[PDB]
Amino acid sequence: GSGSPLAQQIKNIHSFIHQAKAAGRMDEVRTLQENLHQLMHEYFQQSD
């Protein structure tokens, strides 16, 4: 649920994505998006 550390890890990846966009770091953003989505899918699949 939203009190999960995993949920906060996802928020942290979003922050890193934003910070990378702010420098134009498009290669890293695209990779981090995949990582973001992988953790989201774990979060929304695994019971909590």
Side-chain angles (χ1 to χ4, degrees), residues 10-44:
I10 291 163
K11 293 185 185 169
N12 292 348
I13 302 173
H14 287 289
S15 298
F16 289 130
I17 287 165
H18 174 71
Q19 293 168 13
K21 288 180 179 174
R25 292 168 179 269
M26 180 171 288
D27 284 352
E28 192 172 14
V29 166
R30 296 318 185 194
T31 300
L32 290 175
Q33 288 175 296
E34 302 291 312
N35 300 145
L36 177 73
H37 296 172
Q38 288 155 358
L39 278 203
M40 287 174 166
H41 190 76
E42 291 176 34
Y43 176 71
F44 287 114

